[PDB]
Amino acid sequence: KTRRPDNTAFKQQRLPAWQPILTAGTVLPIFFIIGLIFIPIGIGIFVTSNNIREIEIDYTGTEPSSPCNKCLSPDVTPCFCTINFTLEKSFEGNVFMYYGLSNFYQNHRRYVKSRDDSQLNGDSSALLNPSKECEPYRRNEDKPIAPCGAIANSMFNDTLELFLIGNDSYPIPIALKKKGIAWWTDKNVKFRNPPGGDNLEERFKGTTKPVNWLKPVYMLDSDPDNNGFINEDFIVWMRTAALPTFRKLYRLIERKSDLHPTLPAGRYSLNVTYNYPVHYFDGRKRMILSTISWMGGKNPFLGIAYIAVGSISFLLGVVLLVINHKYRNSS
Amino acid sequence: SQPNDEVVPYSDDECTWQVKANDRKYHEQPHFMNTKFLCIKESKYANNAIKTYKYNAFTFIPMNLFEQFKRAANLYFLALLILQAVPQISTLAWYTTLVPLLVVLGVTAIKDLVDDVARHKMDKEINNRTCEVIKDGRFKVAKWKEIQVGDVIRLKKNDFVPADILLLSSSEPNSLCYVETAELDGETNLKFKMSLEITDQYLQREDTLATFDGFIECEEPNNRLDKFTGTLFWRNTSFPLDADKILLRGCVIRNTDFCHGLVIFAGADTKIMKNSGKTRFKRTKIDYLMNYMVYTIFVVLILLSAGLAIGHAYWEAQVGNSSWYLYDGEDDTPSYRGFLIFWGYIIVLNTMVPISLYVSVEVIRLGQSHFINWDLQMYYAEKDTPAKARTTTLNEQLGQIHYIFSDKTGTLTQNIMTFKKCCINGQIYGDHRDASQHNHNKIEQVDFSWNTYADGKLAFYDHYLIEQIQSGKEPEVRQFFFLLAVCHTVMVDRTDGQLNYQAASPDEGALVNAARNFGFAFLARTQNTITISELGTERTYNVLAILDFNSDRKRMSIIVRTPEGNIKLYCKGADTVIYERLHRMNPTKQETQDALDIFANETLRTLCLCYKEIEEKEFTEWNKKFMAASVASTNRDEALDKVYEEIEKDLILLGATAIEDKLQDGVPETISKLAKADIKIWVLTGDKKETAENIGFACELLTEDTTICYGEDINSLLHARMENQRNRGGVYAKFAPPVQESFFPPGGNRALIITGSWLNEILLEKKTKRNKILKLKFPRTEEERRMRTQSKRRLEAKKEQRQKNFVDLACECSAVICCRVTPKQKAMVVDLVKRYKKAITLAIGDGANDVNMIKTAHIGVGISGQEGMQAVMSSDYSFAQFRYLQRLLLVHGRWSYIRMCKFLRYFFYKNFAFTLVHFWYSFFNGYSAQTAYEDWFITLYNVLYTSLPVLLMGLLDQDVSDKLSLRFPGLYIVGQRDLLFNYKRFFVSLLHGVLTSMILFFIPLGAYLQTVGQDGEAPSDYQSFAVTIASALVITVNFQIGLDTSYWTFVNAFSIFGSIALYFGIMFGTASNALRQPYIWLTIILAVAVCLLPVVAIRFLSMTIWPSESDKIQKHRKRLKAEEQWQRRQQVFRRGVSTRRSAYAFSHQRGYADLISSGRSI
C-alpha cells in the first residue's frame, strides 16, 4: 500500500531555516537608533522650512472692508480690483507664483470622472463623439464639445497682474512667464492636439465651445505651440486636486544674471480681473508667492512630526530598559 | 432479572423475507418492488454492493453547492453579485464580478472531488473479492458485488464471509464450521456453527446442490446479531432455524476446509451494516468561528454605510447644491441622493472579508493534509502502510482534542498470548536464569534441541527449569506439565507427521504449545482416549468424564484412568474458586499465592492448577449419578452442575501459570504522554469484563493505588444523590446542593470498570415488556383532560438528569473502561460527552463494530494494515499503529492550529487596514464614496501584492521543532482552552486595523495640506495622493507578516521581499513622478514607523512580563539535557498490602464438549 514516501527535506517539514527570537539586545537598540536619526532629520526640515518666504493675499472680497467687494454680483464690463501688499523682506533666487482655492471639492466622485481621456489624447475618431461619462456637458445644439466634461467646464479664468511701485507714474510691469508649469509627461504624452495640418481651426471643425467658456479652445493662447489641448494653463487645471484646499501653479518669475532681488523689497500692487464666482459656496481665492529650496517647500508638519516621533520612540527605549532589567531572571 | 454483565445486551436497542432457494427471478416480481416518482425504481431485496462515497454521478452539483453555501461568506459574496447587477447603482462595466466567484466555487468543488475519488477507489477493493457462486451448473468464480439474495455459495478456510449465509453443509464431521468474530464483537475465541440435521445428510455435494427448492420465512433486517427467528420450508413438515446456523458478514472462516450456504441477507440488509449508520457532514470548531466573524463584519458594514449616507444627505443640502461646478442634469432630491449612495458604500467598503478567503484556506488545509501522508515517521515498515489522510478538511481540529475513545482488541493489542512463567511448588521459574550452571553467563534463550516436536517456537530463558525435567529428581514438576496437556479441548490435525493444534481458545493454545516444548506432547484423541508422548515414551490414557468450562464455573476438569489402572481428577481454573475446593493439608497453600501476588503485580493473567486421587469407589457412585443426569429435559444444564462439584473437595495444589497479552510496540508510553497533555482516555471494548481489566493494568491506565469501583457500586452512589438530597430522604435540608464537593473525597486515581449491562441500568435506558400500558393513545383509555398520562411521561426529567450526573461523575475518574457494550452503545457514550460538558472528541479503532463510533466522534481514526478494513473506510485519518497518535496530535495537530490561528489573525488586519481608508477619506470629499486608491491597485492588492507571504506562512511556520514538541507535551494545552484565537482576540485584530488605516491616511494628509514640491513637477494632485497611501500600505502589511513568522525558510523571505519588489516594479505618469521626491519618501517612512514601532514594543513587553510556555522552551533550547525515561514503573512491592486482586482471565466458551458426544475427529 503506497510504498514509503520520499525523504526530501520539504516533505518532512525540516527545511533549513532561521529562527529569530526577540531578545534584549535586538529590539532595545532599535528604539535608540531611530531616536537619533528622526530628531536630527526633524530639525533639518524645520530649520530649512522656516527660511522659505511666503505671502498670501486672499483677494476674495467677502468683507465690506476689502476693495474687491465691488464685484461679488457684477452687472457691467469685467471688474478690476487692486490690492496693495508689501514685501517687508526681500525675495532672492527663483520665485513661484501660485493661486489657491478653498471649499472647492475637486475630488468629488461626480466631478472626478467627468472627463474623456480618449478625446484629450488627440483621437481623430472619438473627438466627434464624446463618451457618456460627461453627460451634462457631452453635447450641445447638434454639436459636440471639444474639451468635454465637467472638469474642463469650470476652469479657473481670473487674471492676475503684479506691479512694482518703486516710484509713482511708473508702475513696473514685472515680467511673468507662462510656459513650463506642467508635468513634462502631460505636455508631451498625455495631452496631444488632434492630428491635422497646421491650422487649429480645421482640426476642431464642427465641434462647439464649452458652455461656461468665452472663447473656443483653439484660441486659448496665441503661441502656436502652446494652444489647444496642449495648453499649459489648461493642463494644470485638468490635473485634479486631492483635498478641498489646494494651490496650483500660475507663472514663473525668472531671475537675472546680475545678483538682484528678483522681487526687490518695497511695495507692490496686484491687479485682478475678477471673474471666477467662488463666493456662492463659501469659496475663497488666494494668490501665493513662494521661494525655492533644495529640500522642498515650507512644509513644517514633517519637521514637528519627526521631533515628536523621534522623542516618543526614544522615551520608549528607556521604559523598555527599566522593565527588561527589572523583570529578567525573575517573575 | 439483575444485569447479567456477561451477555452484551443486544436487546433494548417471521415477516416473510422469502429467500426461496435459487429462483433468480422470483424476487423480481412487481409485488415486492418499490416504485418511485420517476421511471427508475428499486426493489425490496438489496444488492451486495458497498457505497461509502457521497457524490455518485449527477447529485454532485446540487449537493456540493448546498454544503458550499453552508459558510456565511458565500452568501456575502452572492448578495453583492445581485447588488452589483442593478444598473442604477452598478459602478461596474460588463460582468467581471461573477467569474471570480465561479472560480472560487470551482476550486473547493474540485478539491472536494479529488478527495471523494480516492474514497470511490477504496470501495473497489472490497467488491472484487471473488468468492465462488453457483450459476446454473457447477461452481464458478464471481465477485462480491454480483451476489444476490438466494444463492448457494462455497467458501474456503481463512476466507471472509461475503454475506449473511445459512450454513447447510461443510467438509467437517457432522458439518459444523468454526468461525471467529474479532471484527464483530471484539472476542478472540472461536465459535462453532452447527448446520441443520436434514441438509447435512442430503446435499453434502456440488452435484445435488444445483437442485435445491428451499424456502425461508425469516424475520426482517434488525441489527440484532443473536436472534434470527425463522423457519426453512424445504418440504413436507418444515424445520426451524436459529442463530446457531447463521454466519454473518465480518466473520472469518477458520479451522475448516470448505463450507456451503444459502444467502439470507445481502449488502445493506446484513446484521452488521445496520449497526453502522447515519453519516454526517463534519465541520471543525474554527468553521463555526469564521461564521460569527462574517456575521459581525456584515453588521459593521451596514452601520458604516448607513452613517456615511446620512452625511452625504446633510452635505448635499448644505454645500452640495449651492456648488455650481457639481451640476448634474438629474433632479434627484437630497434625501434620495443619500439612499442611492448607501448602496454605493456597500460596494466600496466590501473588500473586507474579500473573495480570496476560502481559496487561501483550502490551500493551507490541502498542504497540511499532505504533510500527514508524506510523513516518513508515521510509516509502518512491516506491512507497508503510509498513514493516509482521508478528509483534508478537519486538520485544525486535531489540535483541539479533549477526549479519546479507543477500542481494545486489535487496536491496543496484537492478539498474541506467549506463555510467560510458572510456579511449581512455591518457587517461580523463568526470571532470567534462576539456575546454577549458566547463571552468571549470558542470558541466551534455552535450546530445545532435545525434544523431537520442539519446532523452536517458544521463547524461554530459564536453565534451571529445563534441566530439572531432564533429571526427574523432583517428582512434582513433570506432574505439572503433564496437566497442561490433558485439561483442554484442543484438536490435533496432522497432514504428514508434523502436528498442529486447532485450539478454539487463544489462552489454551498458549499452554498446550508451552507443554510440547518441554516434552509431554499431545498426539491425538479418538472419542475416549488421549495419547501423549512425554519425554519420548508414548502413553494412552482413557477419558471417563469432562466437566467442561463455563462462564460462572471458572474452571475445567477431566477424569482419566492411567494405563496402570489409577483414576484421578485433573483440574485448572481461577485462583478464587480453587481455594474454596482444596484440601486443608497443603503446605504450599500460601507460597503459591505469593507467586500469584507477584504474577498479578506484573500485568499477567493467571490460573491455578490442582488434582485429586478419585479413590476407586466413590467414583462408581458418582459415575452412576453423572450418567443419570447427563441426559435430561430441562435440568440438564443446571442440575448437571450439582453433579459437577459433587467431586471437587479435597484438592491439592501444584502451582500456577501466567500468560501475557502482547500490547503493541509502544502503547503504554503513548498513553503517558497523551495523559500529560491533559487528554482523558476511555476504553470502550466488546471483550469480557476480566480481559478489559488486564489490559487496563498493562497499558498503565489504572495502576496500583487505584480504587476500581465496579459497575454495581456506581448505581448505589448515584441513588444516594437523587433518591435523597433533592426534596426528600428523611429530614429535609431546604438546600439540597448537588455541588457538595465531587461525588468523591479527594485522593484521585479512581478508575471505573462498567459493563454494558450496567450501563443500560445506570442511564435508565432499557426496553420494557408489553404489559405496562393498557392500549394506544386515544380519548378512551385516556381522558380529554390534557392527556394526563400517555402524553405526560416524566421520563425526560430523570433521564436527562441521570445522564448529566453520570458524565459529571466520570470527569474525575482518571480512567474509564466499558466492556461488553453493543456497537451502538459505544456511539451513545461518545454522544453523552459531546452534549454535556461540550468537548472535541476523537475515536480510534478497527473492525465493523467501531464504524458507528467513528462516524459520531468529531474526528475518527481507523487502524489499517490488517485484512479487516471495515473501520478504515468510514474514518478521517488512517495510520497503522496506536503509537502514531503522538505525532498526529502533538506535531501535526498543534502545529496545524497555530498556523490556522495566525492566518486568520493576519487576514483580518491586512483587509481592515486597506478597505477602511475609504472611510476616513469620505470626510474630505463630501461623503461621496470615492476611492482613495487607484483602480488597478484595488483589484491587485489581495491577489498579487499581499497574498503569497501568508500562504507560505500557513504552510511552513512552526513554533518549536518536532523533536522537542513531543518531549514537552504540555504545549498542547494552548490549542485546547481556546487561548491563541477566540472571539476576544478577533476584536483586537480589528482595533489593530482601524488604527493602521488611521495612521496610513492622516500622516499623508498632514503632509498634503501643505506643499511637498515647488518646481512644477510637484505632485500634490489626487494621482500622487493615492500612490503615497498605496505604497505606504504594501510596505507596512508586508512587514507585519515578517514580525509574525517565527521560522524563516528561504522561500519565506523571497516571498516578502518579492511582493514589495513586485509592486514598485510593475508600477514603474504619476508613478515615475511622485516617488522621485524627498518629501514623498519621508511621509512613507514616517507612516511605516509610527504604525510598526508600537507593535514591536507590545510584543517585547508581553514576552518579558507574561511569557507563554512556548517562549520559555525556546530560551533554553540550547541549555537542556536529554531523556530516555519510561521503563516500566518498577513497583516491586508495597508495605500497605491491600489489593490482593485476582489476575484471573480466560477467553473460552461453554459447550465445547462435542468430544464426548460423537468424537468429532474423522
Ligand SMILES: *[C@@H]1O[C@H](CO)[C@@H](O[C@@H]2O[C@H](CO)[C@@H](O[C@H]3O[C@H](CO)[C@@H](O)[C@H](O)[C@@H]3O)[C@H](O)[C@H]2NC(C)=O)[C@H](O)[C@H]1NC(C)=O
Ligand atoms: C469664467 O468662468 C465662469 C465660470 O462660472 C464663467 O461664468 C459663467 O459664464 C457663463 C457665460 O457663458 C454663464 O452661462 C450662462 O449664463 C447666463 C446667465 O447670465 C445664461 O442665461 C446662459 O444660458 C449662459 O449659458 C454661467 O452662468 C456663468 N457661471 C455662473 C456661476 O454664473 C465666466 O463667464 C468666465 N469668464 C470668462 C470666460 O471671461
Ligand SMILES: *[C@@H]1O[C@H](CO)[C@@H](O[C@@H]2O[C@H](CO)[C@@H](O)[C@H](O)[C@H]2NC(C)=O)[C@H](O)[C@H]1NC(C)=O
Ligand atoms: C438644485 O436642486 C434643484 C431641485 O432639486 C435643481 O433644479 C432642477 O434641475 C433640473 C435639471 O435640469 C431641472 O430639470 C428642474 O426643472 C429643476 N427644478 C427646479 C425646481 O429648479 C437644480 O438643478 C439643483 N442644482 C443647482 C440649483 O445648482
Ligand SMILES: *[C@@H]1O[C@H](CO)[C@@H](O)[C@H](O)[C@H]1NC(C)=O
Ligand atoms: C490694471 O491697472 C490699470 C491701471 O493701474 C487699471 O486700469 C486696472 O486696475 C487694471 N487694468 C487692466 C486693463 O487690467
Ligand SMILES: *[C@@H]1O[C@H](CO)[C@@H](O)[C@H](O)[C@H]1NC(C)=O
Ligand atoms: C494702492 O496703491 C496705489 C499705488 O500704486 C494707490 O494709488 C492706491 O490708492 C492704493 N489703494 C489702496 C486701497 O491702498
Ligand SMILES: [Mg+2]
Ligand atoms: Mg476491534
